Design a protein around this ligand. Structure first.
Ligand SMILES: CCCCCCCCCCCCCCCCCC(=O)OC[C@H](COP(=O)([O-])OCC(O)COP(=O)([O-])OC[C@@H](COC(=O)CCCCCCCCCCCCCCCCC)OC(=O)CCCCCCCCCCCCCCCCC)OC(=O)CCCCCCCCCCCCCCCCC
Ligand SMILES: CCCCCCCCCCCCCCCCCC(=O)OC[C@H](COP(=O)([O-])OCC[N+](C)(C)C)OC(=O)CCCCCCCCCCCCCCCCC
Ligand SMILES: CCCCCCCCCCCCCCCCCC(=O)OC[C@H](COP(=O)([O-])OCC[N+](C)(C)C)OC(=O)CCCCCCCCCCCCCCCCC
Ligand SMILES: CCCCCCCCCCCCCCCCCC(=O)OC[C@H](COP(=O)(O)OCCN)OC(=O)CCCCCCCCCCCCCCCCC
Ligand SMILES: NC(=O)C1=CN([C@@H]2O[C@H](COP(=O)(O)OP(=O)(O)OC[C@H]3O[C@@H](n4cnc5c(N)ncnc54)[C@H](OP(=O)(O)O)[C@@H]3O)[C@@H](O)[C@H]2O)C=CC1
Ligand SMILES: CCCCCCCCCCCCCC(=O)SCCNC(=O)CCNC(=O)[C@@H](O)C(C)(C)COP(=O)(O)O
Ligand code: SF4
Ligand code: SF4
Ligand code: SF4
Ligand SMILES: [Zn+2]
Lengths: 31, 95, 55, 114, 208, 156, 380, 176, 297, 41, 96
C-alpha cells in the first residue's frame, strides 16, 4: 500500500514556544 | 449533426428549437444560441461493432474505474447487436 | 532567498530573529505538484469470510 | 378546559389591554408619520391601525388576544424606537401589490384560484 | 463488533441512571420521565410548572452544580397537543457531566422564563419566541431576535413553509424595498425519500 | 471628425482614471467577505491595482456584495447603494449574493442581490476564490474601459 | 437624558445608550445574517445538511463539520476509523490556527493595528491551500463527514504541513512582538471587558471566554473526542478576565495547536478514512463500478441517504470560538427532524451588554473583538 | 496540562524598576515594533503577478461544472438523477427520455450556478463520471442568467476543458 | 395565441403576463415606471436603448431573470427598430426631448422616429401600438414641440390606424420636469390654466390600455382631477418646497393652457382614478427642503 | 386559583401569521398515504 | 519558469497580443490560458503539455475561447426540452 505517511524516523522537532529574544541595553545603560 | 429550422435557428441534439411565432427567440437577438455541435447520437453510431468470440461480453466503458459500472451483455440474438446500456458501444458474437 | 547579505543582515537585525532559517515564502523544499499514484488500503470489513454484516 | 392564563383572567381584562394598546398606537401614528417622513396622512395611518385591530375582532379566547396585545406591543416598540425602517412601516400598506380579483368572474378570467 | 461500531460506555450509563433516579426522587412534584439513551445522555422530562425549581436545583445542588446553560431549544412536534418541546442542555463543570431537561407547551400556555436561573437563557428563549411562538412569562425583554422586524409567523414551526409567505424586492416606483407574496421561479422540489422497508426493528412501535 | 476624436480620447482618459482608481465598499455579510480579505491579503494585494482596501461608502466606486443578503438587511444594502456617488458599480460575489445560493429557498433570504441593486459583475463560487474575485474586479475594469459616455453624449 | 446612537449595519446593528464617553446600555440587534439554516436542514439529508455547517462559523469550517459528524456518528452508533480521527484532529487544529489568526488579527485591525493582519493572512492562505489540496475547496471543504472524512490525504501533503508548522511559530512570535508588550495595545485591552468566573458560567460563555477568567475548562481535555486524549497539549488560563488575557490565551492556543499538529504529523496511522460500513459511508468508486452491493449502497446513500436511528443527542466540541454544539433529533428517517445549532458567539454577544458597562465607545469594538463573533453562527 | 498566561509578578529591585522606567520613558517596545515593521519592509513580498501568475491549485479543485463524454464522443450522462438527488442546493434540474436509438439520455440538464454551492457532491454521486466540477474558476459574468447553465453550456464546458479534466481525474481517481 | 404567451401565475414577478412589450424611450421618466409596472406583472420587456448601458442599470431589478432584454437601437435605423419589435405583441413609444439637439430636432424626435417605429411595427405584425402625444398638441401652436407632436400624432394615426394615442397634460413625479422645474427656477404668473396628471396614473392608464381591447384606435387624454391656474400652482410648489437649464420653447409651453377635451376618453375610461397633486406634491418636493392647498378653477 | 376556564373553540389563526387566502381557500387532505405499488414494503 | 522564485512566482504566462480576433495587447485575460497549460500554470501538475501532452479526443475544442461575457458570443440560457402539451388544431374547412 502507498499512503500519505510521515517518514521512517518521523518529522523533525517543531518549535512552538514564545521566542522574544530579549535584545537591548540595560535600563542603567540607556540613561 | 446539427441542422437549421426555417427561422434560421439551430436545432439542438434534443430537438429543441423555438417556433417562428414564439417570442422567446428575442433572447438570442444580438446574441447567440449556444448549441453543442458534437451530437452524441451521431458519434456513437460512428463506432464499429466489436466482433467477439464469446456468448456474453462485459463492458465497463474503458479505463477500468474511469468508465461506467461493469455490465454483462448477452449476444444470443443474431438479428440485433448487443448494446451497452451505459456507453452505447455495441457488440456482436462473430459466429 | 534572493536578498543580498547586507539587506539580509539589516533585516535579521531589525526583526531580532534569524529570518533566513524560517522563511515565510516557499521554495523547492515543498512537495512536488506531480506525485506518484497512491495505493490506498482497505478497511477491516474487506474480508471474504467471517464477515457477516449482522456481526 | 382549565388552562393557564397569560395576563388576562377573562375577556374584560383582555379588552382593557386591547384598548390600552389601541390608545398607544393612536398616540404614536403622528410621530410615526413625522419621523419616518411617510407619504401617508395621520388619518390614513390611524385607519390602518383601526383596520389591524378590526381584523382580529372575532377572537373570543383571552389567551389569544393576550398574545395579540403582546405582539402589538412588540410592533409598537419596534416603531417607537427606530428599529423598523420606512419600508417596515409601509409594509402595512400593500402599495406595489396589484389588487386581487374579488368576485367569481375575474378570478375565473385570471386563473385557477378559488 | 470492534472496528466500525461505536463502543458502549456502561460506566457513564450506570452513573447517569443513578443520578436520574436521584433527581426523580428529590423532585417528584415535577419529574415525569427519566431516561438514559444508549449513547449515555440523561434526559429529565418534567412538568412545565417546574422549570424554575428543577433548573435551580441542578444549578445549585452540591451533587449537581449544572452551572452552565449550554443550549435552550424548542422542537415542534405537531401531532402532540402540547406541540412544543422545550429542551434545556446543561453542563456541570464540577462533575464533568451534561443533562437534558425537557418540558412542553402549546401555542397559548406561557412557560416561565429561566433568566433568574441562567442569564444565558435571555436570548435563547427569546429565539424560541421568534422561531416557535412560545411566550416566556417574566422575561426581561422578550421580542424578536432573528426575523425581520415586521415578520408575521414563527418560522421553525413545521406548518410554516420553507420559503415564507412574502419576499422582498426593491421597487423603484415607491423608492423602497417592498414585501410581496412569494413567487418562486423554480419551486422547491419535494423529495419523498423514505424507504417503505423498516430500518430499525428495535424502534418498532406496537400496532393498533 | 475632430470632435469625435477628442471625445474618444477623453473617454479613454476618464475610463483609465476610473478603472485604475476603483475604490470598493465591501459589504462583509458572510463567508465571501473572508475571501475578499484574501484578495486584499499580500498574495493577491488589490491595492497594487489601485483597488484600495476598505474605502468609506460615501467615497467608494464599487459596492462588493460579499455574502448572503437577508430580508432584514436588504433595506440597509439599498440605503448604502443610494448613498454611493456616481459612477457606482456593484459586484455580486458568491452564490447567495448572486441568486440566493444554499439559502435560496429560505423565508428570510433575498434570492440574489439583483432584486435590490443593479449588478454589473456576478462572481460565481461558494465562496469564489480570492483569485476569482480579483478576476471579477479586473472584468469590471474592462467593462469600465469600454464605456462610451462622452461619445454617446457627443452623438445625442 | 442621555444619548442614543444607532450604529447601523460581519454585520451588526448596535443600539447604544451613552452618557458622554461611557456606555450605559448596549443592545445588539442581530438577524442580519439569519438565513434559516436549521429549517433548511430539516428538508435535506444528513449528507446534504453537512455543508450548512461549513457556513455557520465560516472561519472554523472543518471544526463545525467535525461537530456535526460526531453528532451523526453518535446517533448512528458507529465510529470513524483511526486515521480519519487523526486527520480530523490535524485539520481541526489547522482550523483553530485559521480562526485564531482571523480573531487576533481582525481584533487588532479594528483597534488600529492593521499590519499583522497582512502578515498572518499569508499563513492563512497557505492553510487554505491545505484545505484545497485535501478537499478541492479553500474554505467550505465538506470534507469531515459522518463516518470519517471524504477522501484520503494526497501524497506529499503532510510534508507541506510540516514545512508550514516548522515556520509558523516565528510568525506568532512577530505578531506577539507587534502587540503583546506594546503599551498602546495594552491600554486598549488590559482593563477592558472584565468577566468574573461566576458570571461567565452563568451567561453561558465557553472557550477562551471562560478560560480568560481563570476557569480551567477545555472540552478537548474534559470531554475528549476523536483522538484528543492521545495528543499532549496545554490549556492557557487567564488571570484577570480581560481582553488582554483572552488575547494571550488565543496566542498560546495557536502555540499549542502547532504542538498538536506536530504530534498528529508524527502519529498519523495507516488505514482507511471512512467507516467500512457501506450502509453509512459510500464505497470506493472502483468497487461501486464492480460490485452489485456497492452500487446499490452508492445509489441509496446518494439519493435516500442513510437512515439514522431515532433519538436526540447534544454533541459539543471545543471549537476555536468555544463550545460548538448540535442538538440533533432524528425521527428514524434519512433526514434530520430537528437540528438546533449551539454557537458560542450567541451567548457571548448576549453577554456583550454586561461586558461593555462602564467602558467607552472605543472599548466596545475591542470587546466585540475579544468575543470572537462570526454572525453566521450567531444568526444561523 | 494547563499554563497561566500573564501570572508574572514583576521584580521590584532597582535594576528591574529602572528597566521598566527606561522602557516607559525611552519607548523601547515601540522601537521594537518599528524594527519588526522595518524588517518586513526589506523582505520580498508575497504578491504574485495576477493575471500573469496564478494561485496554486490541486487536481481536486472544485470550479466550473462540465458534462463529460466517453472516448467515442458518446456523453457519459445516463440520466440517473443521482446528482440532482444529492444536490444540497437543488441546483440541478434533469429531464430525460429515450432518444432515437433507445439510449437513456437527458433532454434537460440544468445547473443554476447561482444556487450551486460548489461542494462537488454531484461529481462524487455520479456513477459514470459524467458531471464533474472542473478546474475553471474564472467565469464571472455580467448578467445573472449567464450563470444558469443548460445542457448545451455544460457539454460545451466538457468539450472545452476535457483535456484538463481528464488529467485531473487521472491524478485523483485512486483517492476516490 | 401561442402557448408561451398564455398568462400564468398570480400576476407577480415570476408570473407570465402574456405581454411582450418593446418600450422605446424606456430610459426616461415615463419608461422607468412603465418598465416597473410591466416587470412586476412578469412581462417580457424589450428595452431598446440609445445611451450608455450604465444609464440602463436601474431598469435591471424591475423584472425577473430574462424578462428585460436590452438592445441597441438608432432612431434613424429601421433595421434596429425591426430587430427590437419583431417578437413583441405591444410596442410603446416614449421617445421625447424637451429641447432640440444638434443631431435631433423636434421633427426627428416627434415625427420621423414615431412614424418609423409605427410603420416598422405595422409591417412586423405587432398587434398593439401605444403612442404618447401631448394634450396641447396643435398644428397652430406657438411652440415647435407641440406643432411637431401634433404632426407626429397625425402620422402615427395614419400609418398605424389601430394605435392607442395618449395625451398627458403635464406629468409630475419624482423625476419629472414639471414640479422639479418650478422648484429649481427660484417663469412668472399669467392666465395659464393647468391640470397636471400623476405619473403612476399615466402608467396605470398605459397598462390598462394594453389590456383593454377597446383602447385600439382610440385617443385618450390623461389629465389630473384638478385644474389650477399657473400662478397659484407655482406658489403652491414654492410653499411645499419651503421656499420664499431652460429654453424659450419650454417657456411657451409653461404659458400654454391645458386644453379641455371632453370628447376624448380619459383615465376614468381605463379604470384609473386620477391622483390629485396635494397627495403627491410632498412626495416629489421633499427633496427640495433644505401648507394650504392651491385654489382650483 | 391560577387557572382560567376557556370554553371557546381553540383557534390560533390570528397568531400563525398565515395570510387569509391560504387559510380559507385551502383544502387540507388528511390521509394515510397509499403504498407505492412498485414495492411490497 | 524560474524555480529560484518563490512558489507562486515560479511559473508565469506572457499573454499574446492577439487571440481569436481580439487585440489583447493591454486587455489580457486569465481565461485566455488554454486548458492544457492551465494545469501547469495553476500548478496542478509539474509537467507542461510540451512534455506530457493531453490525450487527444475528437470532441475537444481545437480553438480555446476566453470568457465571452459582455460580447455577442455570450451564453444565453434557454429550456432545452420540447413542448409538453400538444394543442388541438381546428380544421381549416368550414363546418356547414
Ligand atoms: C538607498 C538607496 C537605494 C540604493 C539601491 C538599493 O537599495 O538597491 C537594492 C539592493 C539590493 O537589495 P536586496 O533587497 O537585497 O535585493 C533583493 C533582490 O531580489 C535582488 O534584485 P533582483 O535579483 O530582483 O535584480 C533585478 C533588479 C535589480 O535591482 C536594482 O537594480 C535595484 C535598484 C537600483 C537603483 O532590477 C529590477 O527589478 C528593476 C528595477 C527598476 C527600478 C529601480 C528603481 C530605483 C529607485 C530610483 C529611481 O540593496 C543593496 O544592495 C543594499 C543597499 C545598498 C545601499 C548603497 C548605498 C546607498
Ligand atoms: C485636478 C485633477 C483633475 C483635473 C480634472 C479632470 C481632467 C479631465 C477633465 C475633463 C473630463 C471629461 C468631462 C468630465 C467627465 C464627464 C463624464 C461623463 O459622465 O460624461 C457624460 C456627461 C453627460 O452625458 P449625457 O448627456 O449622455 O448624460 C448621461 C447621464 N444621464 C442619462 C443621467 C443624463 O457629459 C458631459 O457632461 C459633457 C461635459 C463636457 C465634455 C468635455 C468637454 C471638453 C473638456 C476639455
Ligand atoms: C527628530 C526625531 C524626533 C522623534 C524621535 C522618536 C522617533 C520614534 C518614535 C517611535 C514611537 C512612536 C509612538 C507613538 C505613540 C507614543 C506613545 C508614547 O510613547 O507615549 C508616551 C509615554 C507614556 O507612557 P505610559 O503612560 O504608556 O506609561 C505608563 C506611565 N505611568 C506608569 C507613569 C502611568 O512616555 C512618556 O510620556 C515619555 C515622554 C518622553 C520622555 C523623554 C525622555 C526624558 C528623560 C529625561 C531624563 C530622565 C533621567 C532619569 C531621572 C533623573 C533626572 C535628573
Ligand atoms: C486632441 C487629442 C487630445 C484630446 C485631449 C486629451 C489630452 C491628453 C490626455 C491623456 C492621454 C489620453 C489617453 C489616455 C489613455 C488612453 C489609452 C489607455 O487607456 O491605455 C491603457 C494603458 C494601460 O493598459 P490597461 O488596459 O490599463 O492595462 C491593464 C493592466 N495590465 O494605459 C497606460 O499605459 C497609462 C495611461 C495614462 C494616461 C495618461 C496620463 C494621465 C493623464 C495626464 C494628463 C491629464 C491630467 C492632468 C494632471 C492631473 C493632476 C495630476
Ligand atoms: N411631462 C412629461 O413628462 C410629459 C411627457 N410627454 C411625452 O411622453 C414621452 C416620454 O416622456 P419622458 O419620459 O418624460 O421623457 P424623457 O426625456 O425623460 O425620456 C425620453 C426618452 O426618449 C429617448 N430619446 C430621446 N431622444 C431620442 C432620440 N433622438 N433617439 C433615441 N431615443 C431618444 C431618451 O433616451 P436617452 O436617455 O438615451 O436620451 C429617453 O429614454 C415623450 O414623448 C414626451 O414628449 C407627454 C406629456 C407630458
Ligand atoms: C401604521 C400601521 C400600524 C399598524 C398597527 C398594527 C397593530 C396591530 C395590533 C393588533 C391588536 C389586536 O388586534 S387585539 C384585538 C383582539 N380583540 C378581540 O378579539 C376581542 C374583541 N375586541 C373588540 O371588539 C375591540 O374592538 C374592543 C375595543 C376591545 C371591544 O369592542 P366591542 O365592544 O365593539
Ligand atoms: S456564496 Fe457561499 S461562501 Fe459565499 S457567503 Fe454565500 S454561503 Fe458563504
Ligand atoms: S457542486 Fe454541489 S451544489 Fe453544485 S451542482 Fe454539484 S451537488 Fe449541486
Ligand atoms: S449523476 Fe451523472 S449520470 Fe446520473 S444524472 Fe447526474 S450527471 Fe447524469
Ligand atoms: Zn459500456
Amino acid at each position: 500500500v502507498k499512503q500519505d505517511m510521515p517518514p521512517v524516523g518521523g518529522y523533525g522537532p517543531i518549535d512552538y514556544k514564545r521566542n522574544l529574544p530579549r535584545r537591548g541595553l540595560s535600563g542603567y545603560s540607556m540613561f | 449533426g446539427v441542422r437549421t429550422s426555417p427561422t434560421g435557428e439551430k436545432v439542438t441534439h434534443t430537438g429543441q428549437v423555438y417556433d417562428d411565432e414564439d417570442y422567446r427567440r428575442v433572447r438570442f437577438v444580438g446574441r447567440q444560441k449556444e448549441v453543442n455541435e458534437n451530437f452524441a447520437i451521431d458519434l456513437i453510431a460512428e463506432q464499429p461493432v466489436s466482433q467477439v468470440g464469446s456468448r456474453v461480453i462485459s463492458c465497463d466503458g474503458g479505463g477500468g474505474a474511469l468508465g461506467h459500472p461493469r455490465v454483462y451483455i448477452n449476444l444470443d440474438k443474431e438479428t440485433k447487436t448487443g448494446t451497452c446500456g451505459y456507453c452505447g458501444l455495441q457488440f456482436r458474437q462473430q459466429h | 532567498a534572493s536578498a543580498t547579505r547586507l539587506i539580509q543582515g539589516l533585516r535579521n537585525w531589525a526583526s531580532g530573529r534569524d529570518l533566513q532559517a524560517k522563511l515565510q515564502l516557499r521554495y523547492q523544499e515543498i512537495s512536488k505538484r506531480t506525485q506518484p499514484p497512491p495505493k490506498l488500503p482497505v478497511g477491516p470489513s474487506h474480508r471474504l469470510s467471517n464477515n457477516y454484516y449482522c456481526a | 378546559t382549565s388552562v393557564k392564563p397569560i395576563f388576562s383572567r377573562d375577556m374584560n381584562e383582555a379588552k382593557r389591554r386591547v384598548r390600552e394598546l389601541y390608545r398607544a398606537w393612536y398616540r404614536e401614528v403622528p410621530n410615526t408619520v413625522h419621523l419616518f417622513q411617510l407619504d401617508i396622512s395621520v388619518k390614513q395611518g390611524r385607519d390602518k391601525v383601526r383596520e389591524m385591530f378590526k381584523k382580529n375582532a372575532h377572537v373570543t379566547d383571552p389567551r389569544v388576544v393576550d398574545l395579540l396585545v403582546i405582539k402589538g406591543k412588540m410592533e409598537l416598540e419596534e416603531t417607537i424606537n427606530v428599529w423598523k425602517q420606512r419600508t417596515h412601516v409601509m409594509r402595512f400598506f400593500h402599495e406595489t401589490e396589484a389588487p386581487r380579483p374579488k368576485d367569481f368572474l375575474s378570478k375565473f378570467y385570471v386563473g385557477h384560484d378559488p | 463488533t470492534r472496528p466500525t461500531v461505536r463502543p458502549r460506555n456502561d460506566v457513564a450509563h450506570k452513573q447517569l441512571s443513578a443520578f436520574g433516579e436521584y433527581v426523580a426522587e428529590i423532585l417528584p412534584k415535577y419529574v415525569q420521565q427519566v431516561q438514559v439513551s444508549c449513547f449515555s445522555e440523561l434526559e429529565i422530562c418534567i412538568h412545565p410548572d417546574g422549570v424554575i425549581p428543577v433548573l435551580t436545583f441542578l444549578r445549585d445542588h452540591s451533587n449537581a452544580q449544572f452551572k452552565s446553560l449550554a443550549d435552550l431549544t424548542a422542537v415542534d412536534i405537531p401531532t402532540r397537543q402540547n406541540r412544543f418541546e422545550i429542551v434545556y442542555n446543561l453542563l456541570s463543570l464540577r462533575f464533568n457531566s451534561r443533562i437534558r431537561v425537557k418540558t412542553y407547551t402549546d401555542e397559548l400556555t406561557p412557560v416561565e422564563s429561566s433568566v433568574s436561573v441562567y442569564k444565558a437563557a435571555n436570548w435563547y428563549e427569546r429565539e424560541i419566541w421568534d422561531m416557535f411562538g412560545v411566550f416566556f412569562a417574566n422575561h426581561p425583554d422578550l421580542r424578536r431576535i432573528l426575523t425581520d422586524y415586521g415578520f408575521e409567523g414563527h418560522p421553525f414551526r413545521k406548518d410554516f413553509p420553507l420559503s415564507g409567505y412574502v419576499e422582498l424586492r426593491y421597487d423603484d416606483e415607491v423608492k423602497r424595498v417592498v414585501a410581496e407574496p412569494v413567487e418562486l421561479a423554480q419551486e422547491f422540489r419535494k423529495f419523498d425519500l423514505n424507504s417503505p422497508w423498516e430500518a430499525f426493528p428495535a424502534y418498532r412501535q406496537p400496532p393498533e | 471628425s475632430r470632435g469625435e476624436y477628442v471625445v474618444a480620447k477623453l473617454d479613454d482618459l476618464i475610463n483609465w482614471a476610473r478603472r485604475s482608481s476603483l475604490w470598493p465598499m465591501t459589504f462583509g455579510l458572510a463567508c465571501c467577505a473572508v475571501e475578499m480579505m484574501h484578495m486584499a491579503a499580500p498574495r493577491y494585494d488589490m491595492d497594487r491595482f489601485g483597488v484600495v482596501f476598505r474605502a468609506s461608502p460615501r467615497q467608494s466606486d464599487v459596492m462588493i456584495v460579499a455574502g448572503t443578503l437577508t430580508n432584514k438587511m436588504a433595506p440597509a444594502l439599498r440605503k448604502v447603494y443610494d448613498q454611493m456617488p456616481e459612477p457606482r458599480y456593484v459586484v455580486s460575489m458568491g452564490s447567495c449574493a448572486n441568486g440566493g445560493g444554499y439559502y435560496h429557498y429560505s423565508y428570510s433570504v433575498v434570492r440574489g442581490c439583483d432584486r435590490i441593486v443593479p449588478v454589473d459583475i456576478y462572481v460565481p463560487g461558494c465562496p469564489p476564490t480570492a483569485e476569482a474575485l480579483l478576476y471579477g474586479i479586473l472584468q469590471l475594469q474592462k467593462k469600465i474601459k469600454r464605456e462610451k459616455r462622452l461619445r454617446i453624449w457627443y452623438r445625442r | 437624558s442621555n444619548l442614543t446612537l444607532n450604529f447601523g449595519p460581519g454585520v451588526l446593528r448596535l443600539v447604544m445608550e451613552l452618557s458622554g464617553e461611557m456606555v450605559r446600555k448596549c443592545d445588539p440587534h442581530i438577524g442580519l445574517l439569519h438565513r434559516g439554516t436549521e429549517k433548511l436542514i430539516e428538508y435535506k439529508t444528513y449528507l446534504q445538511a453537512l455543508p450548512y455547517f461549513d457556513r455557520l462559523d465560516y472561519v472554523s469550517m472543518m471544526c463545525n463539520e467535525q461537530a456535526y459528524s460526531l453528532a451523526v456518528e453518535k446517533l448512528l452508533n458507529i465510529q470513524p476509523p483511526p486515521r480519519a480521527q487523526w486527520i480530523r484532529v490535524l485539520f481541526g487544529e489547522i482550523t483553530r490556527l485559521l480562526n485564531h489568526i482571523m480573531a487576533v488579527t481582525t481584533h487588532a485591525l479594528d483597534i488600529g493595528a492593521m499590519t499583522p493582519f497582512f502578515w498572518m493572512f499569508e499563513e492563512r492562505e497557505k492553510m487554505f491551500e491545505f484545505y484545497e489540496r485535501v478537499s478541492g475547496a479553500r474554505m467550505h471543504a465538506a470534507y469531515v463527514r459522518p463516518g470519517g472524512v471524504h477522501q484520503d490525504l494526497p501524497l506529499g501533503l503532510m510534508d507541506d504541513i510540516y514545512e508550514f508548522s516548522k515556520n509558523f511559530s516565528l510568525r506568532i512570535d512577530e505578531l506577539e512582538e507587534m502587540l503583546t508588550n506594546n503599551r498602546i495595545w495594552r491600554n486598549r485591552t488590559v482593563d477592558i471587558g472584565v468577566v468574573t468566573a461566576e458570571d461567565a458560567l452563568n451567561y453561558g460563555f465557553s472557550g477562551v471566554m471562560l478560560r480568560g477568567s481563570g476557569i480551567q475548562w477545555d472540552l478537548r481535555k474534559t470531554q475528549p473526542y476523536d483522538v484528543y486524549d492521545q495528543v499532549e497539549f496545554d490549556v492557557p488560563i487567564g488571570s484577570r478576565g480581560d481582553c488582554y488575557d483572552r488575547y494571550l490565551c488565543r496566542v498560546e492556543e495557536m502555540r499549542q495547536s502547532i504542538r498538536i499538529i506536530s504530534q498528529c504529523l508524527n502519529k498519523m496511522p495507516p488505514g482507511e478514512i471512512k467507516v467500512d460500513d457501506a450502509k453509512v459511508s459510500p464505497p470506493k468508486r472502483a468497487e461501486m463500478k464492480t460490485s452489485m452491493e456497492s452500487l446499490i449502497h452508492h445509489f441509496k446513500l446518494y439519493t435516500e441517504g442513510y437512515q439514522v436511528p431515532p433519538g436526540a443527542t447534544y454533541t459539543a466540541i471545543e471549537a476555536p470560538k468555544g463550545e460548538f454544539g448540535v442538538y440533533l433529533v432524528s425521527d428514524g428517517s434519512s433526514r434530520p427532524y430537528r437540528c438546533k445549532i449551539k454557537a458560542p458567539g450567541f451567548a457571548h454577544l448576549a453577554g456583550l451588554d454586561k461586558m461593555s458597562k462602564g467602558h467607552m465607545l472605543a472599548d466596545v469594538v475591542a470587546i466585540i473583538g475579544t468575543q470572537d463573533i462570526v454572525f453566521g453562527e450567531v444568526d444561523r | 496540562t494547563y499554563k497561566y498566561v500573564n501570572l508574572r509578578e514583576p521584580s521590584m529591585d532597582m535594576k528591574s524598576v529602572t528597566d521598566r522606567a527606561a522602557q516607559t520613558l525611552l519607548w523601547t517596545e515601540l522601537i521594537r515594533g518599528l524594527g519588526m515593521t522595518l524588517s518586513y519592509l526589506f523582505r520580498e513580498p508575497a504578491t504574485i503577478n495576477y493575471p500573469f501568475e496564478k494561485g496554486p491549485l490541486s487536481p481536486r479543485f472544485r470550479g466550473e461544472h462540465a458534462l463529460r463524454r466517453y472516448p467515442s464522443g458518446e456523453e457519459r450522462c445516463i440520466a440517473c438523477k443521482l446528482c440532482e438527488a444529492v444536490c444540497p442546493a437543488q441546483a440541478i434540474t434533469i429531464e430525460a427520455e429515450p432518444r432515437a436509438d433507445g439510449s437513456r439520455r437527458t433532454t434537460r440538464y440544468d445547473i443554476d450556478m447561482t444556487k450551486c454551492i460548489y461542494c462537488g457532491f454531484c461529481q462524487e454521486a455520479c456513477p459514470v463520471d459524467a458531471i464533474v466540477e472542473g478546474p475553471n474558476f474564472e467565469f464571472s459574468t455580467e448578467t445573472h442568467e449567464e450563470l444558469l447553465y443548460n445542457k448545451e453550456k455544460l457539454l460545451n464546458n466538457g468539450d472545452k476543458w476535457e483535456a484538463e479534466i481528464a488529467a485531473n481525474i487521472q491524478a485523483d481517481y485512486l483517492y476516490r | 395565441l401561442h402557448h408561451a404567451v398564455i398568462p400564468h401565475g398570480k400576476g407577480g414577478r415570476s408570473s407570465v403576463s402574456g405581454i411582450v412589450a418593446t418600450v422605446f424611450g424606456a430610459t426616461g421618466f415615463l419608461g422607468r415606471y412603465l418598465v416597473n409596472h410591466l416587470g412586476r406583472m412578469g412581462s417580457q420587456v424589450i428595452v431598446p436603448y440609445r445611451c450608455e448601458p450604465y444609464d440602463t442599470m436601474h431598469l435591471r431589478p424591475m423584472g425577473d431573470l430574462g424578462q428585460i432584454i436590452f438592445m441597441d437601437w438608432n432612431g434613424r435605423d429601421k433595421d434596429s427598430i425591426r430587430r427590437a419589435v419583431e417578437h413583441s405583441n405591444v410596442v410603446i413609444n416614449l421617445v421625447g426631448r424637451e429641447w432640440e439637439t444638434k443631431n435631433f430636432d423636434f421633427e426627428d424626435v416627434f415625427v420621423k422616429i414615431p412614424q418609423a417605429i409605427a410603420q416598422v411595427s405595422k409591417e412586423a405584425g405587432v398587434e398593439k401600438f401605444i403612442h404618447i402625444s401631448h394634450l396641447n398638441a396643435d398644428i397652430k401652436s406657438s411652440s415647435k414641440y407641440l406643432r411637431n407632436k401634433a404632426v407626429g400624432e397625425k402620422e402615427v394615426r395614419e400609418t398605424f390606424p389601430e394605435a392607442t394615442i395618449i395625451k398627458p397634460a403635464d406629468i409630475f413625479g419624482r423625476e419629472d420636469r414639471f414640479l422639479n422645474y418650478f422648484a429649481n427656477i427660484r417663469s412668472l404668473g399669467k392666465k395659464t390654466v393647468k391640470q397636471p396628471v400623476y405619473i403612476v396614473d399615466v402608467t396605470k392608464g398605459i397598462i390598462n390600455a394594453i389590456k383593454d381591447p377597446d383602447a385600439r384606435g382610440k385617443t385618450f387624454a390623461f389629465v389630473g382631477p384638478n385644474r389650477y391656474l399657473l400662478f397659484d400652482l407655482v406658489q403652491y410648489v414654492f410653499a411645499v418646497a419651503h421656499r420664499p437649464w431652460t429654453t424659450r420653447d419650454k417657456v411657451e409651453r409653461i404659458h400654454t393652457t391645458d386644453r379641455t377635451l371632453p370628447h376624448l376618453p380619459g383615465l376614468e375610461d381605463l379604470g384609473v382614478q386620477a391622483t390629485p397633486l396635494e397627495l403627491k406634491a410632498i412626495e416629489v418636493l421633499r427633496r427640495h427642503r433644505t401648507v394650504q392647498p392651491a385654489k382650483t378653477v | 386559583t391560577q387557572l382560567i376556564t376557556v370554553d371557546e373553540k381553540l383557534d390560533i389563526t390570528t397568531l400563525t401569521g398565515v395570510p387569509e387566502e391560504h387559510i380559507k381557500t385551502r383544502k387540507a387532505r388528511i390521509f394515510v398515504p397509499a403504498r407505492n405499488n412498485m414495492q411490497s414494503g | 519558469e524560474d524555480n529560484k522564485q518563490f512558489f507562486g512566482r515560479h511559473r508565469w504566462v506572457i499573454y499574446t497580443t492577439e487571440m481569436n480576433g481580439k487585440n489583447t495587447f493591454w486587455d489580457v485575460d486569465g481565461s485566455m490560458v488554454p486548458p492544457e497549460w492551465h494545469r501547469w500554470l495553476h500548478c496542478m501538475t509539474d509537467d507542461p503539455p510540451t512534455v506530457k501532452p493531453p490525450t487527444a479526443r475528437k470532441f475537444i475544442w481545437t480553438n480555446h475561447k476566453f470568457n465571452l461575457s459582455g460580447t455577442p458570443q455570450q451564453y444565453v440560457p434557454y429550456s432545452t426540452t420540447r413542448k409538453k402539451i400538444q394543442e388541438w388544431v381546428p380544421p381549416s374547412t368550414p363546418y356547414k
